[PDB]
Design a protein around this ligand. Structure first.
Ligand SMILES: CCCCCCCCCCCCCCCCCC(=O)OC[C@H](COP(=O)([O-])OCC(O)COP(=O)([O-])OC[C@@H](COC(=O)CCCCCCCCCCCCCCCCC)OC(=O)CCCCCCCCCCCCCCCCC)OC(=O)CCCCCCCCCCCCCCCCC
Ligand SMILES: CCCCCCCCCCCCCCCCCC(=O)OC[C@H](COP(=O)([O-])OCC(O)COP(=O)([O-])OC[C@@H](COC(=O)CCCCCCCCCCCCCCCCC)OC(=O)CCCCCCCCCCCCCCCCC)OC(=O)CCCCCCCCCCCCCCCCC
Ligand SMILES: CCCCCCCCCCCCCCCCCC(=O)OC[C@H](COP(=O)([O-])OCC[N+](C)(C)C)OC(=O)CCCCCCCCCCCCCCCCC
Ligand SMILES: CCCCCCCCCCCCCCCCCC(=O)OC[C@H](COP(=O)([O-])OCC[N+](C)(C)C)OC(=O)CCCCCCCCCCCCCCCCC
Ligand SMILES: CCCCCCCCCCCCCCCCCC(=O)OC[C@H](COP(=O)([O-])OCC[N+](C)(C)C)OC(=O)CCCCCCCCCCCCCCCCC
Ligand SMILES: CCCCCCCCCCCCCCCCCC(=O)OC[C@H](COP(=O)([O-])OCC[N+](C)(C)C)OC(=O)CCCCCCCCCCCCCCCCC
Ligand SMILES: CCCCCCCCCCCCCCCC(=O)OC[C@H](COP(=O)(O)O)OC(=O)CCCCCCCCCCCCCCC
Lengths: 62, 72, 505, 54, 96, 713, 62
């Protein structure tokens, strides 16, 4: 219990939730709160999302 | 006298041996607003308070304040 | 100062809230069906399941707000209608005001809407309990049962037509429609393997009573060809027909609203059903039966002694209260509490259309909220501690203080402290029963509020207190904001509904 | 007392700590359950104030 | 399980990249490879996990405006019930 | 952009505006309707002069007109109502209202500012205003809200914050209660306050949340609050260095406020609310050690008994409501006599209405007062911490039945069941508790059984029917029981939570203050000659009735219970303090180290000692005040609102030789028992022969001293 | 409108994330985020209250 600290306020929390071990895949830790009342991903208003890479490659190809 | 102190987990929101540095200002900002709320409640309730007559006062039976029976 | 504007606003709001819900459901269903070839979740952030969850939640919530407004309009309308009828005494004058329907939307099923206080209370219970249960079932719906996100919207539409119709046949059909969605939820959403048998028990036990009510409806319709629910004033049933109808109606609706001995299905289903659907079942689905029983028995004239029915209700109360002690399973204990409260409510309806109906309605509301609170607490305990048994769970307060506090305050509210609609309903029922049969009232109060209360409190106190030394690596953290605010809202309603206008109570 | 230890020096005196709820303070999910319940509370309170009180 | 995307674009996640450092020299033949991502969450100073950390006046203003609207609405309603354009305050009010 | 320039300009504008207001007021008085003839004169020069010299008035009027226009627009927008009185255009409205200056006719800036300043002036508040309107409510709400908010916000208020906040609130509450205690008890002041229409309880009924601050209410309220103040001050030392001191303090405050609400209840609904609240908070206090399940068993025992009492009280209230369509306490008290003749048709018997109602009330009262049979929970309730035990057992939890009887006395005066049951059960409980306490070996158990005995005596006093005697007994018992509980709590804390005095010995030196405080408190508690606590038992025996059928058993039990006080007091005091050292060697050695010798040395808390001292002083003063009010030749107690006169005061004012000599029997019984507990040897000692010799000397000297005093002078 | 605006504005993430987003939020954007939901809900409630309150009665006199 003393070590237990899922959030990073008292014990620092890696952005990568866990440290992967050899012979195992890298999976996110199960969150403490598993509520599924989540919206679709939100983006800033007037967010630029044009496929610049594809446009540049097509322009180069001509 | 008391029990020996033991570690309490940081993540757990419990009151074991909790002491706040800013307790003075916390008390100041928790007492006076509560006093004002109670003052408002008190002045609201005083409108519906009843007291018996004073030492030198008698209730006139025919005065409106005197109790009145139902008239069928 | 009452004017026709309020009348038409009330009628328009009541009529249009139903179509608001129906259009929301229709659009959501069209999107769900035509967005994917196979109607199952795509396990990615861009799934339509998020949109459907959003649409269902905030259609129910916005319709609940509109229902608040429409219910207030109805209260004003009914009060002023009674005043208009009562006030004028001149023989030449008579209140004959005729309203013309709007030209925008049609009347669903070509029926003119009629609304009553009990029906709107039932509809409000539907909204709130459905909101709580849908919030609960998020963790249960996953990748093949997402189609059941619309179950509560379907329930709301069925209940809306059920409470806003003056037709006996439509009334009965709406009552009988509730079986399929509930059975499907229990069958496909329940984690436990015993839910498969629990669903069959639920179906058979409820369908026996449904057949009884169907026989009663057939008796009424075949004898009286009317269906308007008000032409029964001009037709009188003989003594034999009336006694048969009341017996069939009482037994059939008591199969649904659990009465002794017909609560085996309820216990099984509550134990083995989803924790989120148990809330909806206990809170609402057992009170449609009470509403239907009230309507039918107040419409029919009955010249029989109700002692047998009162005895059945009191026996159910006594049985549930005595059995409360022997349950180490919190969910089964709450189920027995639900049986007790429902039997008391049903007893409140055993004197025809007397003043007992007011206490019955208030007790139905308080029981809905209290059962929702209790089942939600059991849900939280089971989800964070992976067990809902008293032997495996102990010392909840010392690891999850908020959950323990919620349990303690739930017990206090269940005890029936003054300042709560629970206390008000108990006061109504016991005040009537004291004059009806004082010794029976004493026995009922003693049993329910001492023996059953002690049995109920033993398990909850033992779970809340103690010392959780076992499995220290797996202990949970605390309630979430969602759970905390749900508990707070239940407490807030139970406390503040006592200030509702006393005209209707 | 004989050997009382001051708070500034006692290493086991706790200052206010712990997480109020189980929600992660730094969560990237666009979760709306809390907002929905807060909206329900606020609208109920507003309806009482603007339709029923008085 | 959870399928939402961690890397949001509405704002940049607070982080500290100095708490954990990855070894890049002096390895042995038995030591495991280091880790690529070593950033940790950094909370804003003065953040108190034991309360709501709410510093906005929106809720208070909304509640106060609702109460004020309720007061004025009740005033108008009482005037209408008494059949007057405005309340007729009496010269003396007694307990009741 | 200079602050000094802004302030100077503002001051100049204020002076100019005030001068213009005075000038306009004078001109308006002179020219009530003709002022316009000169103000709005067509002459351009005069118009310019007026505008220039009344610019502050004109600008103020323009601002007022704009504000009024916007306010009217807002009201119309919000309420869909009417227009701005009329449909005046913006330009016409603003010009008209700005030109109009009659709005300043009665307005003076200096007068208005002075009125605003004097509005908050506190010099004005007077005793007469306080007497007209009770400030007890303001302070009680302060205490209640402080406790609730402190419970909710524990992290904000640390140990010190919680202590100081609740201390301030409780001190203010106690001071206000003390101020009103004098008026209510003697000056015939009582208040009936109503907060609002609480709930609807029938088709058209609605009970209001009302409080009744009468003599009956204040007698319990002031006692509970006075005991609670010092228990609160003492708790911070008793629970010193404990993980959870704030929780205990807040539980104590919660129980205090619950009991205060119960005692000062205006109707049966508020009474029932307070009943359930004291039950719940007592449960929490008993179950304070939530980690242990052994404590939970005692808590659950108390909870079950409390729920049974709640059932009885609820059923009685339902019967009252069914009979009379009213729940007001005063109305019920003044109406019950009309319905006395009524009966209730139950299952197969026709029970008298008064008898059944009084039966349920007495049952609940016995359960909550721990009478014989229903007292089983009280010994187990001692698992609570000593402050909680003292508060519950002194005047808070165990006096609820006494309060019920005192408040509903008009009902029980016409109750055959009450007449038969109160004296018998009271005397049996008195005897049982006294003897068990005498034979007890644990301090808290001894105090609990003594509390049971004193509750039995209170029941018997109420049976005698002198409410003044009942109140005096209640006050004496509560104060001294609380003080003794605090003393034994200090003793137990020193002895390391071992409450049995078989492991206590020679504590007089280690706890000097506790020894002397316990001596005083115990001699007062156990009714002993030449002490403040002798008169309560004397008055009880004065008032005891003799028409009972079971009078032999009642009187014998009363005598045995009364004498039993001496044994338990002596055993507790002597065994704790002056007996041979029986405790573990560590208890004494850890405190006998020379390093500890200091001006600060003590085994208790200075705050605890001061709290106990002040409690004893205030208890003495209050008991003396009550004795003067009631037992004096001039009767100055306030009205009790009861028309039943018992004639018991006749044997207090003009006792006869028969009764005067009868009391001597009990006096000499107590004397012989004192001699036994003092001079009786149970163990061999070096002082056996000298002890017998001292007894002989005392007997002979007593005889000779009596001879000289009576005859030889 | 009010419900959806409130949800979308106050459903961006945890407390820290929401606070940082609102801090980076422009002045006018903050004003709308605070005012839109309240204004919509309040207007709805006021329109509801208007119907029950029959102020527009011609008998107002005396
Ligand atoms: C963690 C929770 C777990 C819950 C789940 C478990 C549940 C069961 C177990 C329970 C026990 C465990 C939980 C308790 C521990 C929690 C620990 C914790 O979280 O600490 C942080 C927590 C929050 O503080 P914080 O985190 O430091 O800062 C928060 C923000 O800074 C504050 O920001 P702000 O300053 O901007 O404030 C925003 C707003 C707060 O915003 C809200 O809460 C929204 C409320 C929307 C309405 C919902 C219905 C409200 C019903 C009444 C109750 C009001 C809420 C108070 C809480 C409930 C009562 C205790 O504040 C107000 O303006 C308050 C006024 C509210 C009045 C609204 C009335 C609506 C109409 C009601 C019906 C009609 C009434 C007619 C009355 C007529 C005249 C008498 O600690 C506290 O401060 C506790 C406060 C407790 C309430 C007292 C203060 C409010 C008093 C309001 C007025 C009433 C008093 C008398 C008035 C007399 C004159 C009228
Ligand atoms: C025995 C059982 C005991 C159980 C209980 C035990 C004790 C438990 C204690 C602990 C729990 C309770 C106490 C703590 C609660 C939390 C308090 C808190 O501070 O939390 C922080 C919490 C979390 O903070 P956060 O993460 O930052 O979230 C912020 C919110 O999302 C939103 O924040 P925001 O800053 O964005 O503010 C949003 C606000 C936005 O606020 C505003 O917009 C106001 C300012 C603009 C005014 C309009 C100006 C228009 C013209 C423009 C002028 C220039 C711009 C002016 C504005 C500039 C910017 C300020 O929008 C609204 O609020 C919408 C409400 C609208 C409907 C109602 C009000 C209107 C009524 C009708 C009005 C009619 C007249 C007006 C007409 C107007 C024209 C149509 O935030 C809140 O406080 C939100 C409110 C709800 C909190 C939960 C409340 C739970 C209550 C539980 C009660 C349980 C009662 C049980 C009783 C049992 C009795 C037996
Ligand atoms: C408008 C007027 C005023 C409005 C105010 C309305 C107030 C409504 C009631 C509020 C109750 C708040 C309870 C907060 C409990 C917080 C937790 C705690 O104390 O520790 C729990 C303790 C330990 O908690 P913990 O230390 O593990 O955790 C504390 C921090 N949290 C909870 C956030 C994690 O656990 C227990 O053992 C349970 C004890 C419960 C004790 C409850 C006593 C209540 C007594 C109230 C008396 C009021 C008298 C009223 C008289 C008038 C009646 C009409
Ligand atoms: C013959 C006519 C047929 C009419 C058919 C109606 C078609 C409905 C199509 C729905 C498409 C939903 C996705 C739209 C794109 C969302 C883009 C996005 O997320 O960016 C954020 C932007 C704007 O977000 P924002 O940050 O500006 O937040 C403010 C939101 N508004 C504008 C609503 C105040 O889009 C949205 O937020 C819109 C959300 C739409 C989903 C709403 C779900 C709740 C239930 C209603 C669903 C519709 C059913 C009908 C109405 C209810 C019944 C009357
Ligand atoms: C509790 C049993 C287990 C649970 C399953 C429930 C099954 C039973 C449901 C209730 C049925 C009604 C019983 C009460 C009847 C009261 C009236 C009566 O009969 O008195 C004589 C009545 C009343 O007579 P009266 O004396 O009052 O007045 C008329 C007198 N004469 C005619 C002389 C003028 O007399 C009759 O007319 C005879 C009617 C007999 C009807 C019996 C069959 C009813 C068939 C329909 C319901 C079938 C449901 C089956 C469900 C499935 C079962 C597995
Ligand atoms: C027969 C005449 C009519 C009256 C009938 C009644 C006769 C007297 C009955 C007295 C019963 C007293 C019981 C006290 C029990 C105390 C128990 C206790 O705490 O432990 C022992 C405590 C001592 O506790 P201790 O802790 O110091 O040591 C205890 C030691 N062991 C355990 C070994 C015993 O007190 C006593 O020992 C004193 C009691 C025994 C002596 C009793 C003498 C009685 C004298 C009667 C005089 C009558 C005068 C005439 C008038 C009477 C009527 C008006
Ligand atoms: C004998 C009692 C001893 C114990 C007293 C304890 C203190 C009680 C509280 C003080 C008295 C309050 C009731 C006043 C009654 C009254 O109106 O008495 C009347 C007087 C005016 O006299 P008149 O009304 O007769 O003209 O009231 C005033 O002067 C009001 C001025 C304010 C009085 C104190 C208000 C206290 C409430 C909290 C204030 C917080 C200020 C801001 C803090 C940041």
């Amino acid at each position: 219990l003393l070590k237990f600290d899922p959030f990073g306020f008292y014990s620092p929390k890696l952005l990568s939730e866990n440290r992967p071990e050899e012979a195992m895949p890298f999976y996110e830790d199960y969150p403490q709160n598993d509520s599924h009342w989540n919206l679709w991903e939100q983006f800033p208003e007037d967010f630029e999302d044009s496929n610049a890479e594809r446009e540049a490659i097509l322009k180069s190809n001509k | 006298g008391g029990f020996q102190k033991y570690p309490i987990p940081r993540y757990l929101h419990v009151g074991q041996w909790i002491v706040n540095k800013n307790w003075k200002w916390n008390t100041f900002h928790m007492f006076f607003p509560t006093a004002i709320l109670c003052f408002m409640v008190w002045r609201n309730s005083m409108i519906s308070t009843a007291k018996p007559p004073n030492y030198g006062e008698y209730v006139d039976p025919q005065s409106p304040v005197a109790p009145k029976a139902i008239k069928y | 100062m009452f004017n026709l504007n309020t009348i038409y606003l009330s009628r328009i709001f009541i009529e249009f809230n139903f179509y608001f819900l129906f259009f929301l459901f229709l659009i959501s269903s069209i999107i769900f069906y035509f967005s994917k070839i196979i109607s199952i979740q795509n396990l990615n952030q861009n799934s339509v399941f998020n949109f459907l969850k959003l649409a269902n939640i905030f259609g129910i919530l916005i319709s609940f707000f509109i229902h608040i407004i429409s219910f207030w309009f109805y209260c004003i309308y009914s009060y002023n209608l009674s005043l208009n009828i009562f006030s004028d005494i001149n023989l030449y004058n008579s209140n004959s005001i005729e309203l013309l329907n709007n030209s925008l939307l049609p009347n669903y099923f070509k029926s003119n809407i009629t609304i009553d206080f009990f029906g709107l209370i039932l509809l409000t219970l539907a909204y709130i309990v459905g909101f709580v249960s849908i919030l609960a079932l998020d963790t249960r719906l996953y990748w093949k049962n997402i189609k059941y996100i619309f179950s509560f919207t379907i329930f709301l539409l069925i209940v809306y037509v059920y409470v806003t119709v003056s037709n006996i046949l439509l009334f009965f059909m709406c009552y009988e429609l509730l079986l399929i969605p509930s059975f499907l939820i229990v069958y496909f959403v329940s984690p436990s393997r015993r839910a498969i048998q629990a669903s069959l028990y639920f179906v058979i036990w409820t369908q026996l009573g449904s057949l009884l009510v169907l026989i009663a409806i057939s008796y009424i319709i075949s004898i009286t060809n009317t269906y308007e629910f008000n032409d029964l004033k001009y037709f009188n049933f003989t003594n034999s027909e009336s006694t048969i109808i009341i017996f069939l109606i009482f037994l059939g609706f008591g199969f649904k609203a659990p009465i002794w001995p017909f609560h085996y299905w309820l216990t099984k289903t509550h134990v083995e059903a989803p924790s989120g659907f148990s809330i909806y079942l206990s809170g609402f689905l057992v009170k449609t039966a009470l509403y239907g029983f009230y309507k039918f028995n107040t419409s029919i004239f009955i010249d029989i002694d109700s002692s047998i029915f009162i005895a059945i209700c009191i026996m159910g109360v006594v049985d549930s209260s005595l059995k409360m002690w022997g349950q180490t399973d919190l969910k089964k204990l709450v189920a027995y509490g639900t049986i007790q409260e429902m039997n008391i409510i049903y007893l409140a309806f055993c004197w025809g259309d007397s003043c007992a109906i007011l206490g019955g309605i208030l007790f139905s509301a308080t029981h809905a909220f209290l059962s929702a609170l209790m089942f939600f607490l059991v849900d939280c305990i089971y989800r964070r501690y992976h067990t809902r048994s008293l032997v495996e769970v102990n010392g909840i307060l010392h690891i999850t203080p908020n959950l323990g506090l919620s349990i303690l305050f739930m017990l206090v509210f269940f005890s029936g402290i003054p300042g709560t609609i629970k206390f008000i309903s108990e006061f109504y029922i016991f005040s009537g029963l004291l004059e009806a049969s004082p010794f029976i009232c004493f026995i009922l109060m003693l049993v329910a509020n001492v023996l059953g209360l002690i049995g109920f409190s033993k398990s909850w106190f033992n779970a809340t207190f103690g010392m959780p030394k076992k499995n220290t690596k797996y202990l949970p953290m605390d309630l979430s904001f969602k759970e905390s605010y749900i508990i707070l809202y239940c407490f807030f309603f139970l406390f503040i509904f006592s200030y509702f206008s006393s005209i209707f109570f | 007392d004989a050997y009382y230890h001051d708070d500034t020096h006692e290493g086991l005196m706790n200052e206010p700590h712990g997480y109020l709820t189980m929600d992660d303070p730094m969560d990237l999910r666009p979760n709306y359950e809390k907002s929905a319940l807060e909206l329900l509370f606020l609208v109920s309170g507003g309806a009482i104030l603007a339709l029923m009180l008085g | 399980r959870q399928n939402f995307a961690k890397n949001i674009t509405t704002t940049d996640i607070p982080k500290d990249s100095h708490h954990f450092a990855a070894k890049r020299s002096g390895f042995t033949q038995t030591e495991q490879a280091p880790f690529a991502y070593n950033d940790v969450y950094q909370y804003p100073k003065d953040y108190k996990p034991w309360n709501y950390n709410y510093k906005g006046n929106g809720v208070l203003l909304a509640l106060f405006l609702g109460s004020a609207f309720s007061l004025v609405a009740y005033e108008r309603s009482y005037a209408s019930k008494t059949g007057r354009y405005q309340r007729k305050v009496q010269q003396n009010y007694y307990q009741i | 952009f200079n602050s000094i320039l802004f302030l100077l300009f503002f001051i100049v504008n204020l002076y100019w505006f005030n001068s213009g207001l005075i000038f306009f007021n004078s001109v308006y008085k002179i020219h009530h309707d003709a002022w316009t003839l000169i103000f709005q004169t067509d002459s351009i020069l005069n118009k310019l002069k007026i505008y220039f010299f009344l610019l502050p008035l004109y600008i103020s009027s323009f601002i007022h007109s704009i504000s009024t226009w916007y306010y009217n627009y807002i009201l119309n927008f919000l309420l869909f109502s009417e227009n701005l009185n009329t449909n005046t255009n913006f330009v016409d409205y603003i010009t008209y209202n700005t030109l109009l200056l009659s709005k300043f006719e009665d307005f003076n800036l200096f007068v208005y500012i002075k009125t605003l300043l004097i509005t908050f002036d506190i010099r004005q508040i007077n005793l007469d205003f306080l007497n007209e309107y009770p400030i007890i409510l303001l302070t009680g709400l302060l205490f209640l809200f402080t406790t609730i908010f402190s419970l909710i916000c524990l992290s904000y208020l640390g140990l010190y914050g919680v202590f100081i906040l609740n201390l301030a609130s409780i001190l203010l509450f106690w001071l206000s209660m003390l101020y009103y205690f004098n008026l209510i008890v003697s000056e015939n002041y009582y208040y009936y306050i109503s907060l609002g229409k609480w709930m609807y309880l029938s088709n058209g009924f609605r009970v209001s949340f009302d409080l009744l601050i009468d003599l009956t209410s204040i007698s319990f309220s002031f006692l509970t609050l006075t005991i609670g103040v010092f228990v609160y001050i003492y708790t911070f030392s008793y629970f010193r260095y404990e993980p959870l001191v704030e929780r205990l303090i807040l539980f104590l405050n919660s129980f205090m406020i619950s009991m205060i609400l119960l005692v000062s209840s205006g109707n049966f609904i508020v009474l029932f609310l307070g009943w359930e609240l004291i039950g719940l908070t007592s449960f929490f206090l008993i179950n304070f050690w939530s980690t242990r399940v052994g404590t939970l068993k005692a808590a659950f025992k108390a909870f079950s008994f409390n729920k049974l009492s709640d059932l009885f009280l609820f059923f009685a209230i339902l019967i009252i409501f069914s009979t009379t369509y009213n729940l007001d306490i005063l109305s019920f008290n003044n109406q019950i006599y009309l319905y006395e003749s009524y009966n209730i048709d139950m299952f197969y018997w026709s029970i008298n209405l008064i008898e059944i109602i009084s039966f349920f009330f007495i049952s609940c009262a016995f359960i909550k007062s721990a009478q014989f049979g229903a007292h089983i929970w009280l010994p187990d309730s001692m698992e609570a911490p000593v402050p909680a035990s003292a508060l519950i057992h002194s005047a808070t939890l165990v006096s609820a039945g006494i309060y019920l009887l005192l408040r509903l006395s008009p009902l029980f005066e016409l109750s055959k069941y009450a007449y038969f049951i109160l004296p018998l059960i009271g005397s049996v409980t008195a005897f049982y508790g006294g003897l068990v306490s005498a034979f007890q070996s644990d301090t808290k158990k001894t105090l609990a059984y003594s509390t049971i005995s004193h509750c039995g005596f209170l029941m018997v006093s109420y049976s005698t029917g002198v409410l003044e005697f009942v109140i005096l007994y209640l006050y004496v018992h509560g104060f001294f029981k609380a003080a003794t509980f605090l003393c034994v709590g200090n003793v137990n804390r020193f002895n390391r939570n071992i409450q049995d005095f078989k492991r206590m010995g020679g504590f007089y030196k280690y706890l000097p203050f506790e020894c002397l405080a316990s001596f005083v408190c115990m001699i007062n508690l156990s009714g002993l000659p030449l002490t403040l606590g002798f008169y309560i038992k004397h008055l009880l025996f004065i008032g005891l009735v003799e028409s009972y059928t079971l009078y032999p058993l009642i009187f014998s039990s009363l005598i045995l219970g009364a004498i039993a006080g001496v044994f338990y007091s002596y055993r507790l005091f002597y065994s704790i303090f002056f007996d041979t050292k029986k405790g573990k060697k560590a208890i004494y050695l850890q405190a006998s180290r020379i390093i500890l010798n200091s001006k600060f040395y003590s085994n208790t808390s200075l705050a605890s000692n001061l709290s106990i001292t002040f409690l004893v002083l205030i208890s003495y003063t209050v008991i003396l005040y009550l004795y003067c009010t009631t037992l004096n030749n001039y009767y100055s107690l306030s009205d009790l609102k009861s028309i039943y006169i018992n004639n018991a005061y006749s044997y207090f004012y003009k006792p006869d030789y028969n009764f005067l000599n009868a009391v001597s029997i009990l006096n000499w019984f107590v004397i012989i028992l004192l001699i036994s507990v003092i001079y009786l040897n149970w163990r061999w000692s070096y002082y056996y022969t000298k002890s017998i010799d001292s007894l002989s000397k005392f007997i002979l000297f007593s005889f000779f001293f009596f001879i000289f005093s009576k005859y030889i002078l | 409108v009010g419900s959806l605006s409130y949800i979308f504005y106050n459903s961006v993430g945890g407390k820290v994330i929401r606070d940082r987003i609102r801090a980076s939020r422009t002045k006018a954007q903050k004003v709308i985020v605070l005012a839109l939901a309240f204004v919509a809900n309040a207007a709805a409630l006021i329109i509801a209250r208007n119907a029950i309150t029959a102020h527009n009665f011609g008998w107002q006199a005396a």
